């Protein structure tokens, strides 16, 4: 069974840094392109970044461009996402999504409400304390 288990998150002061990892099993990690999506409270799922099979092609959305770093470990079959200098609007549920088909550069239903190849997600919260 294909499943994804996100680990990390928690309460972090605004402007801080936290690291969260995506665990994968039941499929070949290297053969499948992996994406990162976000779902802010009161808003639908949105795309953040994706990493290619070999990591050669790396892209980010404009809102977080130059702020997050994504690392892919084929040997450890886990996906990394490093964040620093957070903003109060960045608190959401980070869902780790996998592209439906391997050896393809197109991923259609990654940002879907009822996508099958995605994890349960981890809540990240930033607020002044």
């Amino acid at each position: 069974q294909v499943q994804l288990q996100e680990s990390g998150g928690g309460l972090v002061q605004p402007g801080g840094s936290l690291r969260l990892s995506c665990a994968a099993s039941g499929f070949t990690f290297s053969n499948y392109k992996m994406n990162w999506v976000r779902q802010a409270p009161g808003k639908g799922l949105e795309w953040v970044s994706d990493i290619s099979q070999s990591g050669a092609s790396i892209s980010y959305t404009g809102s977080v461009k130059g702020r997050f770093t994504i690392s892919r470990d084929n040997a450890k079959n886990t996906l990394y996402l490093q964040m620093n200098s957070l903003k109060p609007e960045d608190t959401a549920v980070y869902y780790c999504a996998r592209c439906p088909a391997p050896f393809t550069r197109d991923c259609f239903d990654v940002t879907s409400t009822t996508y099958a190849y995605r994890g349960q997600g981890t809540q990240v919260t930033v607020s002044s304390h």
């Binding site: 069974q1 294909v2 039941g26 499929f27 499948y32 439906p100 088909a101 391997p102």
Partner: peptide, 10 residues
């Protein structure tokens, strides 16, 4: 009746 898993795609 029963469910089956193992495939990596649709």
């Amino acid at each position: 009746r029963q469910t089956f898993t193992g495939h990596e795609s649709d």
